[PDB]
């Protein structure tokens, strides 16, 4: 929900790093950072919001300065914090509105520290190094107040000119298509039937193998997977005894179909007929 920013900082050795930053509206990517130019890149025309051209330049300079001090601070205190190269630091921070806000940092892919109200606190399991890291992070209270204001002030502001300006994207309806295939891993004397569902948006979707009106509770639904065009994909499989795949159908329900379910039948060359 709403908006968050993610930061991927890879410290390969003391003299080599990589830095990736991107902004997300709900689950949609809306911005990227080009660290070559130190520029915020707008993936959609509406990802600017109503924010003035020059208000973005200030955010860019703040981002750019906070990044270079971040990489230098981490490398200065790496041995103090027992950070051994190579290591990765991930951050995600953002907000909601109506409401809520968050900012969390991981070291080597595990919870490390997070920002609560006005200061950084260590996750208890992260141990003494997380406490020592919070000493450096809480060095300057003014910098912390600025971090607070980005989460509780700037971030809801940003949705306020973004979710309205681009809900037309998040609320569009794109009908799925579906198709059937043979699954590659059946057990002996059995078949795996595969129902592919592709091209749908938004994400929520219903898919079941059926025998007429009877849902087949052996239907194993996969993860929903992304398509390059922003739509979603799902595979739903059913294991059946051979010959017992007669009268089976895959049924897809989706908001975009307005009750007109897609129904495909295990039939024709799939069976195969005579």
């Amino acid at each position: 929900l709403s908006f968050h920013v993610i930061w991927i900082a890879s410290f390969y050795n003391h003299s080599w790093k990589q830095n990736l930053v991107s902004g997300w509206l709900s689950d949609l990517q809306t911005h990227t950072w080009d660290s070559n130019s130190s520029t915020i890149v707008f993936l959609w025309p509406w990802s600017r919001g109503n924010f003035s051209n020059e208000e973005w330049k200030e955010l860019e300079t703040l981002f750019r300065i906070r990044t270079i001090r971040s990489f230098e601070g981490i490398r200065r205190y790496a041995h103090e914090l027992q950070f051994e190269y190579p290591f990765e630091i991930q951050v995600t921070g953002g907000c909601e509105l109506h409401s809520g806000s968050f900012l969390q940092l991981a070291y080597q892919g595990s919870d490390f520290v997070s920002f609560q109200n006005n200061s950084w606190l260590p996750y208890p399991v992260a141990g003494n190094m997380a406490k020592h890291f919070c000493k450096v992070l809480n060095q300057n209270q003014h910098e912390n107040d600025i971090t607070h204001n980005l989460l509780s002030d700037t971030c809801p502001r940003f949705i306020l000119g973004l979710l309205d300006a681009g809900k037309a994207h998040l609320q569009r309806q794109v009908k799925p298509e579906a198709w059937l295939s043979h699954g590659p891993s059946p057990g002996p004397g059995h078949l795996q039937l595969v129902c592919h569902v592709s091209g749908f948006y938004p994400k929520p979707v219903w898919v079941m193998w059926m025998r007429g009106e009877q849902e087949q509770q052996g239907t194993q639904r996969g993860d929903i997977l992304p398509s390059a065009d922003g739509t979603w994909y799902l595979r739903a499989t059913l294991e059946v005894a051979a010959g017992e795949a007669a009268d089976l159908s895959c049924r897809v329900k989706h908001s975009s179909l307005e009750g007109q379910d897609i129904v495909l039948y295990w039939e024709g060359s799939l069976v195969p007929r005579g």
Binding site: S10, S22, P86, Q108, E177, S181, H182, S198, A228
Partner: protein, 104 residues
Amino acid sequence: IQRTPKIQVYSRHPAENGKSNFLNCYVSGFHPSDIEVDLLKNGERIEKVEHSDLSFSKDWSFYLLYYTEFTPTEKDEYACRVNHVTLSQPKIVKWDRDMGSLVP
């Protein structure tokens, strides 16, 4: 702690010989973020494959989508080849498509 990639291969549309389509390789759940992903046609690397910007899930494991526009024919097989620090050697996952009726 290191986490090995999950690898899922899929097309955007049902396979129809001679119809352009998109081939996808979704790699997810891995850590650290360095990874090598190639799409293969008949065992050989496809040039100029696209991928999404690196991102990560709530549990901090990374994920990427690799894809390319392609046109299958009956004689072609496609796959996704992934290398990662967790892998002794690159893992190849085939695109599973049906050829249709086998025997005339």
